[PDB]
Design a binder for this molecule. Structure first.
Ligand SMILES: Nc1ncnc2c1ncn2[C@@H]1O[C@H](COP(=O)(O)OP(=O)(O)O)[C@@H](O)[C@H]1O
Ligand SMILES: Nc1ncnc2c1ncn2[C@@H]1O[C@H](COP(=O)(O)OP(=O)(O)O)[C@@H](O)[C@H]1O
Ligand SMILES: [Ca+2]
Ligand SMILES: [Ca+2]
Lengths: 116, 68, 375, 375
């Protein structure tokens, strides 16, 4: 669903903005907050086409349209590759120090969507 | 180096399931042609048997009348 | 964290111990299982030697340690040492008392009945444990996916287990116990290296073999074709300058030892390759049970991380076995902690009360209380 | 649909249950009659096993199910299971309550008097059924054509019935009851397969026999001439690659088992072929009744779909019997649902009120109310 019959946000929007500036949330603070959603909206696009890559084991999760996963890390300004390799994939070693994260654990779509 | 091995392994896995699938698919495709030919052949014989037993139906009928 | 007793999570083997805090997902402290003496005389006064050295302390400085192995498949040469091994785990790192929280352990299938009671005696009598339990390795790796119909093969350093646990457990024999895992691999390499002259004698450098192994060594896809490849010096000669100071070009030595896995004939036994034992556990069960077993085969244990361990299975299983269903083996990527993932669950289950043992329950039915009621 | 109580339609056998919604023409849900245990231990916690597994649920996964047969011709080893078998039909699929609509069932001729009351007790006492009835298999397959003078032979998995019901029912003996249908055929094949080595042992694969049977197997026209044909490998060797993975060339095995039908001597009995029993039901009745019986012989039951079942009848009946009338056997094409077609009728009849049983009627004349008044 997208459009609601009862609500007209086009007009209601002016009521929220009147509350934005009146209190003390300048556009500067607004944009700051939006930079979080701006990222989320860049991360949200990350969808998957059920990747049956594994010959047998368990269907992995492939992202061909990487620009969505790339833009996801662009806002965070982190390594696009390592990010996907360190989140979608779990890792642990351990030994008094604090491990070296890299080992891989691709999981099903449900758990992937769950983590997402 | 590890990433290379992971992908290199996928290549062996992709190549294996490809040659295996194509090999059986080609065998299957060739088999279908043989089965299809058998279908057409059997269907033809069934048609000849159907038209024959029908000819006997009208033959056994006219003979029954002459006998009566 | 604070409220509710909050139980710990542990998983002791015959080579590596896995234990962390409480309510965790993965082990926080994995110290090696080693305890030797100073055959030498410690400086004798530069501490009253004793401590055979253990934990990161011993592993850091093997040199002057006669690493004495206490737990060898089933028999524990000495229990006295185990007491001070557990006195380090809960306290020195976790900083929590077992006289406050429950405890969870793993059960090595087909272990002498006298052992399961000897351990519990250490807890109930001295470490005062009103609540604990000892679950079965493989079954834990199971309850952590999304189906009630899969066959599991769990192993590491102890012994190999081919447990077709999916719908239920225990019927004719199916399951198998094979003393051929981890420690066995570390012991076999040194013997074969003697052909080239290299002879890692003492038990200290014996461990170095295991350390070096898990970095480059791999399994032979087909020893026949790989032998002719030896003519070339690119895929064979591997570089590993000893941290001491002497390179060991492990070329044909990497994919030689693993061959023993598929060929137990090289270790004096009639046991066939792991792909025959697979049939041995499938042919026993019903007829209308197979088609779905091939569609799901769980392979747990960090031992199954050797390059060339999974791709071989598809070659041998599809050979001498029914071939009209979906042949599919689930080899979890990080399958070493698969038991730990399931362990954190049992410790949090409430139905667990139906299974676990309470303080008084141990005195009413005697020591056998555990494996005299459960399985 | 909404107005008027609207009664359901059902037809339970000793192998396959036929039931659908209300006012229908054919069964909407035909689940198999199977209920076993997990001899194995369910995972025991990966559900509190119980449910012996049933419906498409059990049939889908036989493997780990010790299929226990409750209903064996007459005797029901246990009634407790039947209670939860009927609790699935009306609700899980039909989504309608029997505490609202009447009910119709089938009557297995010559069934212990105690059984017809035990069932009704489950309805009236617990499932509160103010209106229901249990009609006679064959007679239903009748009232659905266009004449009041035909002999019927209805059977499936239960027992064979040679009922010459045309103008009326019951006089001297005529009718026959023979324990030799469906389940008997599935049980005989496995015994004969042992001659070739094949031995489908457990009761799970026993069902696979029945599944494979209804796809290629056929009846021998003349075993003598077909035996000499064995020399050739075209009409004999039939292909059926086991969904597991092992072809079974059912050549002389297809037309071997059905021979038992005509030759009950192979199952330890004096009963003659089904063409003798035909005479056994004709010779008893009047003399001036035969000429029209041969002109009409109803053959109901999906069992009569085996290739080579009807053409044989004309060969044996015309042999040792009067031969100056029209020998004619009505073998309905889809004759398995012939009972279901007639069932939908009785449930809609108004004269049915003259026959059915009302709530109070069961208490006034006691439990015997049913077969103490009707027939
Ligand atoms: N990254 C790795 N690759 C291959 N083998 C590994 C790796 N990490 C650890 N191992 C091996 O796994 C074994 C220890 O696994 P573990 O599950 O702890 O065994 P156990 O519980 O039987 O003591 C050792 O043989 C070790 O060399
Ligand atoms: N297409 C078919 N051809 C031949 N036999 C069939 C076919 N479909 C079902 N059957 C058989 O019919 C029998 C079941 O018929 P059914 O009328 O339900 O029996 P019952 O009511 O006695 O349980 C089984 O033996 C089954 O193998
Ligand atoms: Ca182990
Ligand atoms: Ca019947």
């Amino acid at each position: 669903c997208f459009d609601v019959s009862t609500i007209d946000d086009s007009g209601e929007f002016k009521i929220i903005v009147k509350a934005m500036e009146t209190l003390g949330l300048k556009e500067s603070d607004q944009n700051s907050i939006w930079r979080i959603l701006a990222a989320i909206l860049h991360i949200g696009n990350i969808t998957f086409a059920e990747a049956a890559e594994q010959r047998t084991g368990t269907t992995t999760v492939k992202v061909s349209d990487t620009k969505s996963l790339a833009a996801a890390a662009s806002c965070l300004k982190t390594d696009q590759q390592s990010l996907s390799i360190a989140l979608c994939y779990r890792s642990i070693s351990t030994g008094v120090g604090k491990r070296c994260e890299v080992i891989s654990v691709p999981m099903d779509c449900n758990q992937a969507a769950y983590s997402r | 180096a590890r990433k290379l091995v992971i992908i290199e392994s996928d290549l062996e896995r992709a190549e294996e399931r490809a040659e295996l699938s194509e090999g059986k698919c080609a065998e299957l495709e060739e088999e279908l042609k043989t089965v299809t030919n058998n279908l057409k052949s059997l269907e033809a014989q069934a048609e000849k048997y159907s038209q024959k037993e029908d000819k006997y139906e009208e033959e056994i009928k006219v003979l029954s009348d002459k006998l009566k | 964290d604070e409220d509710e007793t909050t139980a710990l999570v542990c998983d002791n083997g015959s080579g590596l111990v896995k234990a962390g805090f409480a309510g965790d997902d993965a082990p926080r402290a994995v110290f090696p299982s080693i305890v030797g003496r100073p055959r030498h005389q410690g400086v004798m006064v530069g501490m009253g030697q004793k401590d055979s050295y253990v934990g990161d302390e011993a592993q850091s400085k093997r040199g002057i340690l006669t690493l004495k192995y206490p737990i060898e498949h089933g028999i524990i040469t000495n229990w006295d040492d185990m007491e001070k091994i557990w006195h380090h785990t809960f306290y020195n790192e976790l900083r929590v008392a077992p006289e406050e929280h429950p405890t969870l352990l793993t059960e090595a299938p087909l272990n002498p009945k006298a052992n399961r009671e000897k351990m519990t005696q250490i807890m109930f009598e001295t470490f005062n444990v009103p609540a604990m339990y000892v679950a079965i390795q493989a079954v834990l790796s199971l309850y952590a996916s999304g189906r009630t119909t899969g066959i599991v093969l769990d192993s590491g350093d102890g012994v190999t287990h081919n447990v077709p646990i999916y719908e239920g457990y225990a019927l004719p024999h199916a399951i198998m116990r094979l003393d051929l895992a981890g420690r066995d691999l570390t012991d076999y390499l040194m013997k074969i290296l003697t052909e080239r002259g290299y002879s890692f004698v003492t038990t200290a450098e014996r461990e170095i073999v295991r350390d070096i192994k898990e970095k480059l060594c791999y399994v032979a896809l087909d020893f026949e074709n790989e032998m002719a490849t030896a003519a070339s010096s690119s895929s064979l000669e591997k570089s590993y300058e000893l941290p001491d100071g002497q390179v060991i070009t492990i070329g044909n030595e990497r994919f030689r030892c693993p061959e023993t896995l598929f060929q137990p004939s090289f270790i004096g036994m009639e046991s066939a390759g792991i792909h025959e034992t697979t049939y041995n556990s499938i042919m026993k069960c019903d007829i209308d049970i197979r088609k779905d077993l091939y569609a799901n085969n769980v392979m747990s244990g960090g031992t199954t991380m050797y390059p060339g361990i999974a791709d071989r299975m598809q070659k041998e299983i599809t050979a001498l076995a029914p071939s009209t269903m979906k042949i599919k083996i689930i080899a979890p990527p990080e399958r070493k902690y698969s038991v730990w993932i399931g362990g954190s669950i049992l410790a949090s289950l409430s139905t667990f009360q139906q299974m676990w043992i309470t303080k008084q329950e141990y005195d009413e039915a005697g020591p056998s209380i555990v494996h005299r009621k459960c399985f």
